[PDB]
Design a protein around this nucleic acid. Sequence first.
RNA 1: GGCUCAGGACAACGGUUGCACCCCCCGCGGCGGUCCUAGCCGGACACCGCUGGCAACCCGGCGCCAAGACGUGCGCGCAAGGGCGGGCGCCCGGGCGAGCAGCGUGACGCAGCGACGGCCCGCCCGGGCUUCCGGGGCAUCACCCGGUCGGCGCGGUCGCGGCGCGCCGAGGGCCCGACGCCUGGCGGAGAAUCAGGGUUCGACUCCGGAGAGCGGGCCUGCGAGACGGCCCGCAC
Lengths: 167, 258, 170, 59
Amino acid sequence: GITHDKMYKRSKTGAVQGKWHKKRKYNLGRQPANTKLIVNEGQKISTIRCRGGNIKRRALRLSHGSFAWGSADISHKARILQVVYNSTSNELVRTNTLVKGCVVQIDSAPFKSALSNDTLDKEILDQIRGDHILARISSRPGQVGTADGYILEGPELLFYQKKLAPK
Amino acid sequence: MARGVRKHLKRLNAPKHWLLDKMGGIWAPRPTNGPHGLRECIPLILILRNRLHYANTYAETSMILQDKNVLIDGKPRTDPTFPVGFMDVFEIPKVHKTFRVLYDVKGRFTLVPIQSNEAGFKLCRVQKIFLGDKGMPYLSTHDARTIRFPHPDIKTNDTIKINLKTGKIDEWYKFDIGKIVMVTGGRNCGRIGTIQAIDKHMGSYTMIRMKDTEGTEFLTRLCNVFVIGNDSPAVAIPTTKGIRPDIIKNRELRLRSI
Amino acid sequence: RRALERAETLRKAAYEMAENQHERAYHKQSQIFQGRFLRKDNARCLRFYKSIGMGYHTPITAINGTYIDKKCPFTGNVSIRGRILRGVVHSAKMQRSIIVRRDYLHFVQKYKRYERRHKHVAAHLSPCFRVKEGDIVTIGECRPLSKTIRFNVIKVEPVSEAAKKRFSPF
Amino acid sequence: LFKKLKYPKVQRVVTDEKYARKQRVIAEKKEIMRKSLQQLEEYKALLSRMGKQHNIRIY
RNA sequence: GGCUCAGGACAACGGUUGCACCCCCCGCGGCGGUCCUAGCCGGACACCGCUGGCAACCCGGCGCCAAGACGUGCGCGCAAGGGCGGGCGCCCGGGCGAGCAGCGUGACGCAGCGACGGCCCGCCCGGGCUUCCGGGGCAUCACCCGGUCGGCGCGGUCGCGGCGCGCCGAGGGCCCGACGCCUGGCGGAGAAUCAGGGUUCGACUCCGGAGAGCGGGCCUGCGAGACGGCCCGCAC
Ligand SMILES: [Mg+2]
Ligand SMILES: [Mg+2]
Ligand SMILES: [Mg+2]
Ligand SMILES: [Mg+2]
Ligand SMILES: [Mg+2]
Ligand SMILES: [Mg+2]
Ligand SMILES: [Mg+2]
Ligand SMILES: [Mg+2]
């Protein structure tokens, strides 16, 4: 099946090597999870029997995760509304596919329920008084079956705002 | 490539120091995993059949062991292929024979008869200090033994004294210049001597310089240097004091014996 | 005062580096937590660096630098382990990589003579070094960084452009 | 539900030896936990001139 | 374990490094605290009895009954993953040559053990890859490569990596013989020959690699892309 063995590649000089054995089970891969944001249908997580009896769980559909505000040391569970930027490709954003590094929009209710009454970063307050906050995904969906992350702040937040402003 | 581990062992591929006859057969005993590794151990059956001669075949060893007629570190063992290593305790109460397994000068296993005063403890080498679950310190030894909560003064490469009945440290001898050692690896297995110098090369091995009691000097790496006391061995050792004679003297001794 | 000047150069870099909109993603150093740059006081270190050891010294450029390189041995997250070798630079057309030429000797017993051989070895060059052709470099082994790369530069002596090529085993 | 005499042997019935076995197992487990606890406490009493890092028991 | 040497020529293999990029049954030694009827829980199937199909191979329907089997499960908080937590030119303990392990703390989630108590950790054998050096002939084969060369990001993997995908740049190898073609090409430890220097061979005893008519795919399992295991196409 799918494999990542190097026997099927070329040499540094661009030459064909030649195959000297059949395919082996250490060098195998699997079809990507393609985790979809929900926006019969519900949180669906499957399990995979890996090498040595280990268990690897990949998520197919999900909608909630744990997020943090490092500067204010605030951490709660929120709902992810949609994905809005991804460096790798725009197709993933249109299809709302969850992967590490995707910039998402979360709801503000769990945070505004306790914020807007303490001196903090101005921009985070502006997001809080709205209906969504810019955040990022830090976990690896498809390997641990979870979608955690942290709230943006600083130069990177400016970078992403400048990137998605014209749209 | 074999699809799994190896369960056999050709006689011609066996370690040299086991002293197995070429015509004995195609196969040789395969030691099982335990206190010591394949190349740093010897099976029980070899001691009990090819040396002491209390048995003539595999079956007799099987019956003797399954009847529980041998003790190892105070524990009866019933596996003919159980591995016996270095600084171990061998007891057969039926004939009141107590042995500690050490190395001879020529580089082969031997049995040193001992007394009852010192058969309640063994010496072990510490070569790994690490943090376990919850962060609780541990340590390991050359015989696959783990002890929880050691004294901070104990460091790596040291030597530890532990009671057979209870795995509780009694005393520890440090690794330092001016201490008697016993070599246990390579060309100089079995030689007894005192340390003189220590030279370290970053990222690689560490070499130890020792001088025999008669003035001979030799070297080896730190992975096969064992401490046996402070200036004097703590345990009883074979008749000879770890002196490797030359070929001329060995030939003379053979001629005398013939 | 020296610390205050350093932070501004470090702090300032992360700004226009963000305005460099051509980049697909915001490049950052993993160890640091973005948010310290908002602290007006110099209450937290803005840059991360380590010591390679083996008797080597961290160049001032990395410490006073402003670049990002995950594969750099000083400011990145890779370690040097194994064999240390020496060679000369053969090519430097790649982005952050070079080709190092190594010279040795082979002995043929029948004719009781030697032959001169050479090999090509690829290495990753951190932005903390300036190197041209014919310079002498010291490379340290690391984990696979690519298809043909397992080495990273740690030192480099300079050389003059005019210098008759000389077979130089090291 | 409520010559040789053949009747089935019974199963799942509790006899004294099982009660004794369960009680002994509980006692041994409690003893083991207590021994580990006191060893840890003695170790912590020691190390009065150094540092420690261990998992605190919550609850 | 045993048989063979078809395939394969910077590969395999031989010596030498590393995993601070890894997995690991038996065995040995430790450790063992589990969130919200416990004098002992529930239902099945096998063999077996009655009843039957078909040339053979194969199985059907009803029926009470057993578990160190299956399922639930009493219990002192605990799996995986994730955020924050060091320095001011360099150097001068848990451990290192090397800021690596562990821990605390803010949030997620209730994984594993438990109706005669073992999840977990260390060692061992083994495996995977990886540094350096060696590794057939023809120039009536002189230019070759285009995921080919590097960078950034994600996915997948026991795991690093153009291993796969998207974007960007252009690159890499060569008379110290690339690339291409051929080989009645398994390799080494070794064998034959005989002043010394060497020539030829190396199916076969030991180590390693590959295969089970050709080409592919997969379940069980710690471990197999296994064939005295199954599925497909082709030739018999
Ligand atoms: Mg519970
Ligand atoms: Mg059960
Ligand atoms: Mg052939
Ligand atoms: Mg063979
Ligand atoms: Mg096969
Ligand atoms: Mg097959
Ligand atoms: Mg057959
Ligand atoms: Mg078979």
